[PDB]
């Protein structure tokens, strides 16, 4: 009867086209502002002093870029970790010079993605679902907050944060290799196993369902039209695909349970990306990966090279060349 109850009834209605919910009250204003500023800053945005040395790095399309090289540049080294909104900038020209829109996009992104995650919970509550799709979405939220939030914190500047682009991503990955040795760190190892394993069990499960489909169509029409939507009959012989994989490797390595099978597809990647995103986090605070340089010596004591020493000389090439003007002192403490 009241105005608030007629508003709570609408905002929590599943009869809307897109469910809004109470998290959409701060998902939609956040992500539309992260979007509408991203499209403008990617297309039309002046160059940005990223190294704090007043050498402005172009990143937008109107200043001679493309899809690959164009990128929303991170904020300045001069700012660093300080909060830099528009009203604390004394003009928009001073805001866009010092890496303004990187903080406006990222902070409205991480609020909107952490609200998109809670929105996946909310609709599962109002639909009668068991709730935990949003726990599986915690794994890219852990990884998005690792390279945009946690790594600028432990390194003390948003300038070490990830550039919102495509070539800026590979500037981020290579400089992160030289300074932290991520490939030898066992948490990037535990998530390469998460996505190689994840793409394995995806294409391994998706093939054994498509292999054991039941005849419901003719050879002229499509294979997919043998599934009517909302039917109650099972659309594939699960005993058939169990007997196949029960002979392809051996018998006891096969899940006859389809529920425990469809749980292992959700376990393996998500655990692999939780562990990986806490690799960037523990390497944000300079707890680097393994270092086996000069580890094998002869009885005389001369250093015998290994593959890690060849990997070290690739890291030394990126270390002596990243931010080639920003350094003045012999050790990259930042």
């Amino acid at each position: 009867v009241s105005l608030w109850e007629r508003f709570c009834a609408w905002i929590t209605s599943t009869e809307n086209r897109l469910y809004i919910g109470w998290f959409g009250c701060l998902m939609f204003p956040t992500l539309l502002t992260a979007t509408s500023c991203f499209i403008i800053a990617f297309i039309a945005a002046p160059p940005v002093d990223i190294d704090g040395i007043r050498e402005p790095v172009a990143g937008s399309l109107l200043y001679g870029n493309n899809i690959i090289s164009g990128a929303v540049v991170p904020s300045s080294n001069a700012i660093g970790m300080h909060f830099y909104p528009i009203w604390e900038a004394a003009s928009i020209d001073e805001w866009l010079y010092n890496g303004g829109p990187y903080q406006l996009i990222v902070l409205h992104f991480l609020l909107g993605v952490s609200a998109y995650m809670g929105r996946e919970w909310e609709l599962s509550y109002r639909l009668g679902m068991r709730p935990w799709i949003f726990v599986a979405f915690s794994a890219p939220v852990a990884a998005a907050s690792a390279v945009f939030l946690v790594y600028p914190i432990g390194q003390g500047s948003f300038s070490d944060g990830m550039p919102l682009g495509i070539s800026g991503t590979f500037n981020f990955m290579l400089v992160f290799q030289a300074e932290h040795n991520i490939l030898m760190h066992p948490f990037h190892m535990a998530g390469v196993a998460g996505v190689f394993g994840g793409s394995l069990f995806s294409a391994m499960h998706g093939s054994l369902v498509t292999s054991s489909l039941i005849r419901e169509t003719t050879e002229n029409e499509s294979t997919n039209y043998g599934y009517k939507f909302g039917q109650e009959e099972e659309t594939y012989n699960i005993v058939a695909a169990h007997g196949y994989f029960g002979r392809l490797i051996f018998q006891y390595a096969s899940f006859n349970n389809s529920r425990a099978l469809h749980f292992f597809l959700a376990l393996w990647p998500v655990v692999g990306i939780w562990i990986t995103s806490m690799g960037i986090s523990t390497m944000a605070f300079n707890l680097n990966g393994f270092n086996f340089n000069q580890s094998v010596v002869d009885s005389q004591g001369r250093v015998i090279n290994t593959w890690a020493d060849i990997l070290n000389r690739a890291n030394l090439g990126i270390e002596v060349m990243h931010e080639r003007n920003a350094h003045n002192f012999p050790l990259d403490l930042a």
């Binding site: 086209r17 001679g64 493309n66 899809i67 939507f229 909302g230």
Partner: peptide, 30 residues
């Protein structure tokens, strides 16, 4: 002149995302 093509590819991609969400073929039981 060159960046005009890149912008048209990007907003043209966001058009077909708009039509796929709202003008989707709504699936129906029976």
């Amino acid at each position: 002149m060159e960046a005009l093509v890149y912008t048209f590819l990007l907003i043209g991609t966001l058009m077909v995302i708009f039509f796929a969400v709202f003008f989707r073929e709504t699936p129906r039981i029976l």
